[PDB]
C-alpha cells in the first residue's frame, strides 16, 4: 500500500485526464499500460547526508535522486536544496521533467533530486561542506552517460561548482556530469540568453506556420513583461530580428513605448544594469534616456497589456499569473495573434481558455495562438543539451553556433506540439491545432512509443 | 588441431589469393605475417541462452559474438538470428566485415554475433524474452567504446529495441551501443535512404575522376533495376542531381521510360506505396499515371537492360545475379560508362570479367567502370558511423548534414579502393584502376599497417 | 622535509615572480592560496618497469605520470623517454603544461610523464617490449576522460602506437586515450601544419586588434627564418592569406627576395623536397628557379633580418636565440610591427626586452608587438584538442574543418593573453597590452578561478 | 639516470646487499643477484596533494604518500605514519624493511608504507578527522582487502584508523579488512595491543633455550626494558608472567629504575599505563606512592636506563628509534647482557649491531651477547595484523588464546628460520651462536626473490 504523495498524485492525475480528453486511447488502447509502467520510477536512491557547520556540530539531512525514465536519454533534471524537499515533491518534478525534456527532441530522460538542507543563513563554507558530503554518496549513481543533474531552487552556479569538484575528486574524471557549469570548465555560451532567445525562436516557428512562410518577427510590435534574464534577452532577439520591443515591466509598474518605435539594445542594457543593483524601473525614468517623454511613458502599478495599444505578439516573462482573462481579451481586441510564456504558468487558466476558444472560433491567421511555458520556454533545457554535446567533444562552440542550434531545437519542440495536436485533438479544416493540448500529450507519446520499442512494457 | 570452418576457410583463401595476385608482397613481404595474425580472432564469446516460450517451457539456444579485430576502431558488425548460425559462419561474415568496414575510412573494427534462435513462427512475446536473455550475457562484453552491434538476418528494429532496452536495464547507461536504433531513441536521419544514396554518391566520384570533374549525373540517363528501398532512394538522388531515372523493375517484370525523360519523385512514391501493399508493377499500369503509353512501357518477365536503349549509368539494385554476360556487353554496346551494385553480388562473375576486360582494353572515359558491392553500397555501414557520432553528443543532425557527410564517406571509400589499385595492381598509363581489386585489398592494407603501428605484429 | 627539486623549484619561483609583478595579488590577495594549493600535484604515479632486451636479460627502468591539475579538463601532456628523467624534471614540465594548456581555451588539464628508459641505440623490438611493460601499469591511471598523454623527447608516432595498442588489449577499448596518433587509427589532419599555421593565425589576430580590423596579412611583407616544416607551413599560410614570404634560411645561410615579389608555393615545395634530401640552400641556388638573381639572392653566413630591407612581420621558426638585441633594433627600423615565435626561445631576452620597451614607448600601431612562443606555437596543442574532439565521435574531419578550428583556438589564446594583460598589467591609453605578461598570468588565473568554483581551495 | 637522494633507504639497501654477500648465498645461487636490482625498485608509489580545513575554516595543504613496494608474497602490508619529517625517501626506507619483516611471519603478506607529513601536534580531533576524510578519499582508489591493507604507526593510532576506515566504507561501499589495528567491535583482533611486546619476549625466550642448551629461560632473569608505551608495557608483563624481573622503564624525559633486586609489578605497570593515557610523564608520578618509595625506585632525569640498572641479563629497547649506540652496546656487554632484541622499530644503530656481531664472533657459547634484528624479532605486532585479516576474511572473532597460540607459533618458526638459515649459509665456528642478523636477512630475501622469480618479476 502506497504512502501519501499528494504533489505527485495531482501531476499524475493532470496527465491521465489530458490523454483521456483526446483520441489517444481510442487509436491505441494499449497505452494505458504505458501510463501504468512509466509512472512508477525506475529508481530512487535516498541517502543520509552528514555535514559539519562552522561551529563543528554534526548536522543531518536527507538527500534524494529520483531517476524516473531513461528511454530517450540519460536521466536529466535539476537538484533542489530547500527544507520542503521530499520524495513526493521530487517525483512530481521528476515525472514532469521526463515529458518536458522529451518534448524538446533531444536524447534526454527524466528525473529530479536534491535535499532538505536549507541554504538560507548558511555560510559559503557550510554550503561547500554539505555539497562535498552530498556528492560523496551521489557520485555513485550519476555520470555523463547515466544521469546528468543540474541546478534548481537553492542550487545555481556555486553549488554546481562544489558538486562538480567533488565528483572529480572521487571519480577522477572530467566530463559533462553536471550542467549549468562555469564557462571555463565546461559551461556553455548562450546559457544566460537561453530562455529569452528560445521563446522568441519558438514564436517565430508559429508565425511562419500560421502565415505560410510570408511573415516573421520583422515589422511586428512585441509587448513584454519583466526585466530579468528572460525579458531582456527575448527583447534583444525581437530587435535583432527587426521587430519592435514596445514594453518592459517589473513588479511595480510598466515602461512602454509611446507610439511607434522600440527599445534599442543600448536601452535594454541600461535596464539590466539597474536590475543588477536591484533598483526598480520607476528609479531610472527621471534621467536620460528614459526621461524622454516622447518615447517612454511609465505607468505605475500596471501590467503592460492594456497600455500598449495595437500589438501582434505577447510574451509574459515576469512571474506566474501575470495575464488575466480580462487582459487576454484586451490583447485579442488589440490584434495580437501570438502569445507564449517566458515565465512558468504565466497565463491564468481563465486566460488560457480565452485564447483556446478564440483559436477554436477563428480559422487560420485570424486566431490568437497560444504556447504554454513547457514548450516555448525550454531554451534553458535545450542549451543544457548543447553543454553536454560540447562536453562530449571536449570543445567550445561559438556563440553563433550554439544560438543557431538552439533555434533548430525549438523547431523540434514546435513540431512535436503541432503534429501531436493535429493527430490527437484534430481541429477543423482551416483551424490551428492546440499547442497546449499537443504539448501535454507529445511528451507522453514519444516516451511510451520508446518504452514499447525497448520492452519496458508490452 | 583446427576444426572445419568451410565458410571461413573459403573467405580466408579468396583474400590470400587476391593479395598474392598483386605487388603487395614484393614490396612488403613482411605483410604476410599480418595475414597470419589478422585472421585469428582477437576474441570470441560463445554462451548459452535459456529462454521461455509462450507455453512455459525451457528453450535452449547458442549465443555468439566474434570480435575479430579492433585496430581501426571498436568492434563493428551485425547480429544474425537464423538456425544456420555457428562460429564458422559468424567468423566468415565477421572477417569480411573487418575489411569492408575498414574500406570506408571511418574508425570501425570488425565483428559478428547472433544465435541459432529461429524467429520464424515466434510470437513477438517469445522474441522479446529471447532478446532479454541474449542481452543479459552479451552486455558484459560490449559497449559503445568497445563493441557496437546492429541488424542482419532475423534482427531488425524489433530486436535492436529489445536488446537496447535490456542493455540499458543492466548497464544503467544510455549510449550508442547498438545501431539501427529508432528515430526517437538515437537513430540517424537518412537511415532508410543510406544504401541508395551512398551508391549514387560513389558513382558521382567515379564520374569526376573518370572525366576530371567535367561530368556528373547532370544530363545522364540511369538504368535502375529493383523497386524496394535501395532502388527507390538511388533513383530519387539521381533525379535530385539532374539525372534521368529511365527504368525500374521487380521480380515479375520491368517499367521503362519511353524514348527520353525520367521517373519523377511522386512516381517513385506511388511505386513505393504499391510495394508496401505487396502488389507488383504490372498491376498499376492499368491506371494513371503509368497508363501513359507516351511515357511508360511495361515489359513482362524482362530485366530492364536490353530495353532501355542507350544509357550512361547502370544501378543493379534488385537481386543477386540480375546481369548476365550477354547483358554486360549490351550495356557496353549502349555506351554505359558506370555500373555499380546497389544490390548485393548484383553482377555475375562473367559480367564483372566482361567489365574488367573492357577497362583494360580502353584508356580513360572510353572504358566501362565497374564498382563492387563492398564499395558501392557501404552507405548503410557509413550512416552507422554517423548514428554513433550523433549518439555521443546526444544530439540529432539534420537530413542535410547526415546526407552531406554520407557523400564525404563514400568519397573515402572510393579513394581507398582507387589509390590501392594505383599502388598494388597498377594499370597501364591512361587506363583506369580496378575498383574490384582496389577494394578487396584496401581493407587488408589499412588494418595490417595499423596493426603493425600498434604492435599487434612485428 | 621536501626533496631537492631544482628544475621545478625554479619554474615555481618564475611564476610566483610574474604573479607578484602585477595587480593580481592587490585585487585578489586570496589567490596566493591558489598558488599554494595548485602547486602540489593532484596525484603522481611512479612505477617499476621491468622489460627484456634482445639478449634475454631482465632490465629495469622507472616510469612516471604526474597528474598535476585537472580543473579545466582531464590531464593533458607529453611522455618523455630520456635518461635525465626524474620526478623533478617532470614536475617542472607538468606544472608549465597546466598553464600552457589553459591558454588555448580548450578543456585540458596538465600533466607530464615518462621514464628514465634510454632509446638511443635500442632496437625497435626492445622499445616495443618496454612500451608494453610500461603501459601495462600506466593503463590503470589514464583514459579518454581521465588522462590523455602524448609525445615528447623519446616518444614519437612509433612509441605512441606501441602505447595505444597495449592500452587496447588490456582495456579492450578504442578511445582517444593518446594524441599524436597515426592517421588511420585516430589521427587528425593539419597535424604537420599545426605549429606553422598556428603561428600565422595568431599574428593575424594580432594585426586585427592593432588596426581595429582593417589590416590582415593581405599586402604585408613577412620575414621568415628557418626552412623546416614550421617555417614552410607558416610560409604557405602567409601566401594563402595574400601576404609575401620574402625570406627563408638554413643554419648555413639565407635565401631572400630582391625588392617586390615573394616566394611561391611551388618554390617552397622545392625547398621542402631538397630539405628531405638533407641538402642545403647554398646547393640549390645553382639551378633554376632560384638561380634567377633578379628574384632571389643567397647570403652565406647570415640570418635574414638585416638583408630583407623594409618589412612588416617577422616569424622566427628555425632554432633558438636567432634574433639578438641588435636584430630587434633593425627589425624596428625596417618598420616591423609584428613578431611571433614558431621556434621556442626564438627571441633572446634582450630582443624580448627591446620589443616590450619599444611597445611601451609607442602608442597603438606605431609599436612593434611581440607574441611569445607559449601562445604563438600553441598550434600542436590546439590540434591535440581537435584530435580528441574527433575521437569522441569516431568521425574524422576534413583538412578545411580542422584548419578553420585551429584558427579559432588561436583567437581564444590571443584573447586570454590580451584581456589578462588589460586587466592585471593595465597599459596606458593607446598602448598595446603585453602578450608575454598576458600569457604568463592568464594560465594561472583561469586555473585558479576554476579551482575555487570547484572548491579545490577556499 | 637521475636519482634523488634518499639516504635512509640507500643505506638499508647497501647494508642488506652486504649481509647477503658476506655469506655462501650468491656462490650457491648466483642468479639471486638479479632479484637485487628488481626488488629494490618499488612496484608502485602513489603521491597526492591532501587539502583539508582547520577549525577556523582556513584551507590547509599536505602531502600524501603510499609506497607499494613488493607484492609477490601477498597484498601490500604496512603502516601509515603522520609526521612532519615524512617524505618518499623515508617511506621507501620503512617500506623496503617492511617487506622482509612481513615475509618472516610466514603469512602471505607483501610490503609497503604510506603516510602524510601532516603533523597531528597541537590539532583537534575535528582537524584529524577532517584530515583522514580528505586523505582517505584519494587513498581509497589504490587499496583494498586483496590489494593493500595499511595500519597504524607514529601519528596514526586507533583513532586515526577508525576515521580512515569509515571514509573508505562510505566511498567504496564495502566493509572489509582493508585496514588493521581496528577496534574490537568493527573487525578488530584480540591481542593486537599486546602483540609486539609479547612477540619480542617470545622470540628472545627461544634465544635463551638455544644458547643455554635448554638450561635457562626468563625465570630468574633481570631484563632492562626501555620505553613506557604499549610495547614495553606488555613486553614487561610477559617477562613478569614468565618468572623474570623488569628493572627499568623510561620516557623521553627520563628512566625509572629498580633498586637492588626486585621487579616492576603488573599493578605498577597498569598505573604507568593510565599515566601515559593522559600523556603525563615519569617525572610527574614519582612524588606520591607507590613510586615515592625510594628503597624500591630511583628516578633519573635525561638518562636512558642501561648504565643505571647495573647487571642485566636481557635488554629490551622499546622507546624509540636509534636509542642504542656503540657506547650503550658496550655498556650492555659489560653489564653481563647476553640477549638483546628491539621492541621499538629500529632501536639499535648500526654501531650497536657491529658491536654485538663482533662480540658474537669473538666469544664461543653463552659468553656471547646475541642480537636479534627488527625484521625477525619485533614482527609480533605485524604477525597479528595478518591474523586480523585472517579473521575479517573468516568473518569471526577468535579468542585471546587462539590468536596467542598462533602468534606464539609465528615467532617460533621465525626464530627457527633465522637460526637454520644462517647455519646453512653463514655457518659459524664451533660453539659460536649463528648470526640472527645475516640469517633473518637471507631467509626473507630468499622467500621474497624466490616467490618473485616464479611470478616472472625477474629471470
Coordinates of C-alpha atoms in Angstrom, one line a residue, chain C residues 70 110 113 282:
Chain C
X70 CA 42.6 18.6 -13.7
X110 CA 48.1 19.4 -17.1
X113 CA 55.2 11.5 -17.6
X282 CA 73.5 27.1 -50.9

